[PDB]
Design a binder for this molecule. Structure first.
Ligand SMILES: [Cl-]
Ligand SMILES: [Cl-]
Ligand SMILES: [Cl-]
Ligand SMILES: [Cl-]
Ligand SMILES: [Cl-]
Ligand code: NA
Length: 129
C-alpha cells in the first residue's frame, strides 16, 4: 500500500508516535517519505547483504528475521515480511524500539540528512489530526 501523507500521519498518531521520545509527528512522516516514498512494500539491499523493509526501511541486520542475513539479530521478534503489510502496526512498534536504543532518529540516515534541522511540522500541515 502507498499511503497518503495525511493518511499516514493519522495512522502514526493513532499508534502513539506523536512526540514519542520527543520527536514530533512531522519527523516520522518526513523519514517515511524519504525512506520508502510512503510505500509499505519497499525493500532495499545493503552492501553487507542485509535488507531494509517497509515504510520505515527497518534493517534485517538488527531488527527482523528474513532467513538470509547470517549473523544478524531479530530485536523486534518479527519476520521482516511483517513489515511489508498494509497495516503499519508492526513497523510502528519496531520503530519505537529503534528510536529508544540511544541514537534517536539518527538511526535513519535519510532522517539525519534530509529531515533533521528542518521545519518538519510542514509534513503534517493541512492534516486533520
Ligand atoms: Cl511536527
Ligand atoms: Cl527525493
Ligand atoms: Cl537470517
Ligand atoms: Cl533523542
Ligand atoms: Cl531533501
Ligand atoms: Na535479522
Amino acid at each position: 500500500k502507498v499511503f497518503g501523507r495525511c493518511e499516514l500521519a493519522a495512522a502514526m498518531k493513532r499508534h502513539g508516535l506523536d512526540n514519542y521520545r520527543g520527536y514530533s509527528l512531522g519527523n516520522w512522516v518526513c523519514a517515511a517519505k524519504f525512506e520508502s516514498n510512503f510505500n509499505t512494500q519497499a525493500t532495499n539491499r545493503n552492501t553487507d547483504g542485509s535488507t531494509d523493509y517497509g515504510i520505515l526501511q527497518i534493517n534485517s541486520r538488527w531488527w527482523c528475521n528474513d532467513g538470509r542475513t547470517p549473523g544478524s539479530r531479530n530485536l523486534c521478534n518479527i519476520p521482516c515480511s511483517a513489515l511489508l503489510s498494509s497495516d503499519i502496526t508492526a513497523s510502528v512498534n519496531c520503530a519505537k524500539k529503534i528510536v529508544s536504543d540511544g541514537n534517536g532518529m539518527n538511526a535513519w540516515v535519510a532522517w539525519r540528512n534530509r529531515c533533521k534541522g528542518t521545519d518538519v511540522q510542514a509534513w503534517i500541515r493541512g492534516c486533520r489530526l
